[PDB]
Every structure is written in C-alpha cells, then in structure tokens.
C-alpha cells in the first residue's frame, strides 16, 4: 500500500538512448558486452569489456568494438583511467550534456538507474528508469552482468556514476575496527564514479558495515522500536559500531534510542515489519509517516 | 538490498512538464491534464460538494477565476463538463505532444508510474517528476496529497491509464461480493487507498455517480495483489515442496483468486496453514521483503 511505498519524487531526464549505447567486444568465436556511458563529450567505458592488457591491447582491442565506431569516437585518444576506458567524441555536444553531482561518494539517498534496452512491444531501443537507494557508491537495484555501465542520479538529476559490479551477498563487521558487530550474523551493488572512484579497497568477498541506510532513518526507525515516547536517552556507542552513526549525529537529529532494546530484541525488530515496511527499508527511507498539514509543522 | 528491491523497469517517457500544469482557483488547487488536444480538470477544483460546486464553477464562468489557464492556451469558451471532468480543447494541436493510451486502463495490473509537475525552488522553475509503484484495477499505492489530484498515471511501456483522482488513510474489508467478513476485516496494520480515474470517467467504486463528493469509507477486499504473486508467496509459506493440494475456496473470498487461476499458475496452497498463521506471516518478512510486498511483485527469486 501507499503506507510503505518510499514514493519517490525524482525529476524526469530527456536523454536519447544513444547516450548508453549497448558496445560488444567479439573475438573468432565469443562475444562480452555491456553498456557505455556517453557524458559530456566522452563515453567511459569499463575494463571487464574485455587477460584483460592482451585483449585491450593498449587501446587497440577498441578496433574490434561493435557500435564504437571510428566516426563518432576518437579511438586513437582513449585513455586508460583505472577500470575505466575513456573516449572523447568527434563532436563533443552530439550527445547532449547532462549535470554532474559535485560529490557522488558522499550522496545518501533515493537514486535512479537509467539503462538502454530494446522493447520488443515496441520494437525500438529505449532508455528505462529504475528507483532505489544509494548509500555512498553502494546501492539496492537489482543488475546483471551487462547492465554495467548503466547511469545512476540522484533526484535532481544530477549523475553519480556508472554501474560497476556486485555480488550475490556480503559479509557483515565493524570495519572501522576490524571486529564483528551486530550485523555478522544481502547482495551488494557497486558504482565508480567518472573519475574511477570505487567506494571499496583495493578495487583493480565485498565487506560492508551495516545494511544499506540513511543516518536519519534509522535514528527515527530505532526510536520507534525502543523508546516510543522519545524520552531522553544517551548515545549508545554501539550505533557507532552496528550502525556506523556518531553521537554528534545522534545528539542532531533528537531520535532517542534504547539500545539494549534494540540489541535483546533483535532478531524480532529486524525480522517483522513495522505497519508494513521491512526494517530494511525503514532505515533506508523513514517511517514515512502521514504528512501533517503543512501549517501544523514548525 | 536488490534481493527486496523489485527494480522494475519503466520506459523513459519525454514529456514537457507543460502536459501537467497547476492550476489555481482563487485558493484551491490540483493538476490539469493535457492529453491529445485537450486538458482534463477534475471538477472537485470548484468545490467537494455538489451545490459549492455549480456556483463556483457556474457553468463554466469559473474558469475566468483560475491561474494557469490562460485564454490563449486554451478555448475557455469551448469547456465542457464531461462528468466529474472538465475538458477544454487546446487552442494548438499538438503543441504538446500527444501520448499512448491504455486500451483497458481498469483492467491493468502491475507495476505503474505517477508522473506531476513540481515547482522546484532550487531551480526556480517547473519540472516534471516521476514516481513508481504497483496498481490493480484502478487502485494503487503510489503516496499522494490531496492537491495532486490530476497526477498521470502510466504503465510501462508509457500507455497513459489515467489520472490520480482520490484516497484515504486506510480502508476497511469485506468480501464485497457477498457481504460477509473475510479474513481481511480482522487486519489491523494501516492500508491507505489512491483511486485512479479514467479519461473516460471509468473508476473502480462502486456507487461511481457523483464519488468525488461522496463522504464514504473506502471498501476493499483484499490487499493490492497480483494473483500470480500472491498464489508464489502462499506456497512459499505453506508448501514449500509444493505437494499438490486441491483449490480451497476461501482464495476467492479472501484473495479473489478463482480455482481457474489456482489451477493455472501452478502453485499449490495449503491454505489451513495461513489461516491459521495469519498474523504472524503478514508481519513478518520473507527474507527482507514485507508481505504486501511479496504479493505485489513475486519473491523476487
């Protein structure tokens, strides 16, 4: 129901499909694939399109590229950046240019994945928009292995970063310390952004710290399990370690929480819902609340 | 994570935000729709309830009171009440451009798209804003305030099914086929209602004359579900090798899924098990999908 459906308003994009073109390195006898992304007079594209220095050739596996072709691209100055291969266009406004976000890793929040496909009803290729949740460069829209290369925004519309990799599940501990937390007892989704930023180590098994989420979220969320009255309660430091959220956040957004109410009851408050939102979607999104008249707010 | 996320795949539909505009009586306020030469406005601008209604929107002299509709976009002069809707043809044909439409918009059901015109006050200017979600049969569960009324809904190939047109914060339910409760009554946990309206005045209530100035508790009988969803999550719960078992008939009265669809899908029940489960499987998750989730979109497997 509209009780637990995040909503999401995001602004709508006008891009034409050729600005993710599907590109398809062949061999005699395979064939690998996955899409491009053509920003602001360049098209990046990832290294696993192609072990990989003999067939990328120092930029001469680029020759043997359906739908890269030498008179829109300008395959003689493609430049090897990490995981990325990036190419400049012959004309650079071709493609329409699209907005930036000024700080990609550091984003928390509702995101859309755009990616090319070809519809069969309607016997074209196509752009397709799909909604979900970033928590820097890490985020929850189910992929396949081609889709890398798929452009992801924020709700202004602003890019991000490409689809990069992921995994079927990851495991859980206090990263910041190397020890287990609460949560090592989940597939992930990656994205780099243009300037091959990776939010993981080593990027050339995935540990995270907790479940994807927004700090406020899950102060709210925790509250409402522990301590429905928000009666004032200290900073457990243990929302550092499970949830990696400081007691300055804490103090800031005034969610009180009962901790050990949380850590005696935890496998209830993780494994039933709250009205109808999972606790994995309530820490991502909010309770989300019916809004109060906006005259009764202050 | 993905595993709960169904990510479903809309096309990206190139609309100027012009298609939705705000329009203002003054102060009331919802969206105009302009689909294929004329714009569509919900009569409840004027007024929710039928004699504030007629004097306001006085046969039509109303119209010189509202913002956003100026003489030179539209044909002021040439608007007709076409039930609960207002159409004005445009003055310019295809100065918007002209949109699909469903050819069976109430019988749709799965994923759909909201789209609304927004103002943004960091870009000091209107924009279009799309938001996803799930709909049966005219109903859907897209979050809505009441001035959004007039907000699109398609589907995702961006066949125009309608337009958003009413809700509540929750609903009660019966087996409105028969009158009697269904397992449904007991529920407890909150389930809003957001109610599509067709541009051809079809909308899935019963008692539709006159609805917008209707007083009335929404009814449903179930959940918004799809059958197929809904007959994978039941077998998940309560048959997980999935023996044969026959059809038991208080699918139809608590699900509206006939023996015909049972029979179809494939999926076998064992429906004493949810019954006798009920609270328990509706609150819990299933690997970290919510129920209502589950019978909405499948188990995502």
Redesign the interface.
């Known amino acids: 129901?509209?009780?637990?459906?995040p909503?999401?308003?995001?602004?709508?994009?006008?891009?034409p499909v050729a600005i993710n073109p599907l590109i398809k390195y062949t061999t005699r006898t395979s064939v690998s694939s996955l899409r491009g992304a053509v920003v602001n007079g360049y098209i990046y594209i990832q290294r696993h399109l192609f072990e990989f220095e003999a067939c990328y050739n120092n930029g001469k596996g680029l020759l043997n590229c359906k739908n890269l072709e030498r008179s829109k691209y300008d395959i003689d100055s493609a430049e090897l950046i990490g995981t990325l291969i990036r190419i400049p266009l012959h004309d650079k406004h071709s493609i329409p240019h699209i907005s930036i976000h000024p700080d990609p890793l550091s984003y928390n929040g509702p995101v859309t994945?755009?990616?090319s496909?070809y519809?069969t009803?309607?016997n074209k290729d196509?752009?397709?928009?799909?909604?979900?949740?970033m928590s820097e460069g890490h985020?929850?829209?189910?992929?396949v292995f081609g889709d890398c290369g798929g452009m992801l925004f924020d709700p202004?519309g602003r890019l991000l970063g490409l689809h990069c990799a992921?995994s079927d599940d990851v495991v859980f501990m206090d990263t910041t310390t190397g020890k287990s937390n609460i949560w090592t007892s989940?597939?992930?989704?990656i994205m780099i952004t243009l300037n091959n930023e990776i939010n993981l180590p080593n990027p050339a098994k995935v540990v995270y710290q907790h479940?994807?989420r927004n700090v406020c979220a899950t102060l709210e969320t925790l509250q409402h399990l522990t301590n429905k009255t928000n009666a004032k309660l200290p900073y457990d430091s243990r929302l550092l370690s499970d949830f990696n959220i400081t007691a300055e956040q804490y103090n800031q957004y005034g969610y009180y929480i009962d901790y050990n109410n949380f850590v005696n009851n935890f496998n209830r408050y993780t494994?039933?819902?709250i009205?109808?939102?999972?606790?994995?979607?309530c820490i991502k999104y909010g309770l989300?609340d019916?809004?109060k008249p906006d005259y009764y707010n202050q």
């Open positions: 129901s509209a009780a637990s459906n909503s999401i308003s995001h602004i709508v994009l006008e891009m994945l755009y990616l496909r519809d009803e309607l196509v752009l397709c928009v799909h909604t979900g949740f985020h929850d829209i189910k992929t202004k992921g989940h597939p992930s989704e479940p994807l494994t039933t819902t009205g109808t939102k999972s606790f994995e979607t989300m019916n809004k």
